[PDB]
CSV table of C-alpha atoms and ligand atoms in Angstrom, one decimal:
chain,number,residue,atom,x,y,z
A,1,UNK,CA,-76.9,-198.1,38.2
A,2,UNK,CA,-80.3,-198.8,39.6
A,3,UNK,CA,-80.8,-202.4,40.6
A,4,UNK,CA,-84.1,-203.8,41.9
A,5,UNK,CA,-83.9,-207.1,43.7
A,6,UNK,CA,-87.0,-209.5,44.2
A,7,UNK,CA,-87.3,-212.7,45.9
A,8,UNK,CA,-89.7,-215.5,44.8
A,9,UNK,CA,-91.7,-217.4,47.6
A,10,UNK,CA,-94.9,-219.6,48.0
A,11,UNK,CA,-96.3,-217.3,50.3
A,12,UNK,CA,-94.1,-214.3,51.3
A,13,UNK,CA,-95.2,-210.7,51.9
A,14,UNK,CA,-98.3,-210.3,50.0
A,15,UNK,CA,-102.4,-211.0,50.3
A,16,UNK,CA,-102.4,-207.4,51.8
A,17,UNK,CA,-99.7,-207.3,54.4
A,18,UNK,CA,-100.4,-203.7,55.4
A,19,UNK,CA,-103.5,-203.2,53.6
A,20,UNK,CA,-101.6,-200.6,51.6
A,21,UNK,CA,-99.0,-201.0,48.9
A,22,UNK,CA,-97.8,-198.5,46.1
A,23,UNK,CA,-94.9,-199.7,43.8
A,24,UNK,CA,-94.0,-200.4,40.2
A,25,UNK,CA,-91.2,-202.6,39.2
A,26,UNK,CA,-89.5,-202.8,35.9
A,27,UNK,CA,-90.1,-205.6,33.2
A,28,UNK,CA,-87.0,-207.6,31.9
A,29,UNK,CA,-86.6,-208.0,28.2
A,30,UNK,CA,-84.2,-211.3,28.1
A,31,UNK,CA,-86.8,-213.0,30.0
A,32,UNK,CA,-90.5,-213.0,30.9
A,33,UNK,CA,-90.1,-213.3,34.8
A,34,UNK,CA,-90.8,-217.1,34.0
A,35,UNK,CA,-87.5,-218.3,35.3
A,36,UNK,CA,-85.0,-216.0,36.8
A,37,UNK,CA,-83.3,-218.1,39.9
A,38,UNK,CA,-85.0,-217.6,43.3
A,39,UNK,CA,-83.3,-214.0,43.5
A,40,UNK,CA,-82.8,-211.5,40.7
A,41,UNK,CA,-81.6,-208.0,40.1
A,42,UNK,CA,-83.1,-206.1,37.3
A,43,UNK,CA,-81.7,-203.0,35.8
A,44,UNK,CA,-83.1,-199.8,34.5
A,45,UNK,CA,-81.4,-197.3,32.2
A,46,UNK,CA,-81.0,-193.8,33.4
A,47,UNK,CA,-82.1,-191.9,30.2
A,48,UNK,CA,-84.1,-194.9,29.2
A,49,UNK,CA,-86.5,-197.5,30.0
A,50,UNK,CA,-84.0,-200.4,29.3
A,51,UNK,CA,-85.1,-203.1,32.0
A,52,UNK,CA,-82.9,-205.9,32.3
A,53,UNK,CA,-81.4,-208.2,35.0
A,54,UNK,CA,-77.6,-208.3,35.1
A,55,UNK,CA,-77.6,-211.9,34.8
A,56,UNK,CA,-79.8,-211.9,31.8
A,57,UNK,CA,-77.7,-209.5,29.9
A,58,UNK,CA,-74.5,-210.6,31.0
A,59,UNK,CA,-73.0,-207.7,33.2
A,60,UNK,CA,-70.0,-208.6,34.8
A,61,UNK,CA,-69.9,-205.7,37.2
A,62,UNK,CA,-72.6,-203.2,38.6
A,63,UNK,CA,-71.3,-199.4,37.9
A,64,UNK,CA,-71.3,-197.2,41.0
A,65,UNK,CA,-72.6,-194.2,38.7
A,66,UNK,CA,-75.1,-193.7,35.9
A,67,UNK,CA,-76.3,-196.7,33.5
A,68,UNK,CA,-76.6,-195.5,29.7
A,69,UNK,CA,-77.2,-198.5,27.6
A,70,UNK,CA,-75.4,-198.9,24.2
A,71,UNK,CA,-78.3,-197.1,22.7
A,72,UNK,CA,-78.0,-194.0,24.7
A,73,UNK,CA,-74.3,-194.1,25.4
A,74,UNK,CA,-74.0,-194.1,21.8
A,75,UNK,CA,-76.0,-191.1,21.1
A,76,UNK,CA,-73.8,-188.9,23.3
A,77,UNK,CA,-70.6,-191.1,22.7
A,78,UNK,CA,-69.7,-189.2,19.6
A,79,UNK,CA,-71.3,-185.5,20.6
A,80,UNK,CA,-69.7,-183.4,23.3
B,101,LIG,ZN1,-84.6,-211.5,32.7
B,102,LIG,ZN1,-80.1,-196.1,27.6
């Protein structure tokens, strides 16, 4: 599963840094990035845009394969 980690800091790697940065992170649904601990890990679906921290959703362990949320894993659950 795709897991992105981010750490908060008063003055970290920002305000230019290398005068060239291009990246687009995900947006958790359980929280509005207002209080997710100093370091958190977001999770994006492999067939969807379900972006939720594994701590926010309550995921016991992070699979070492594809991540299909209940909506998609259910869509293909019946089919074959
Ligand atoms: Zn969250
Ligand atoms: Zn999904």
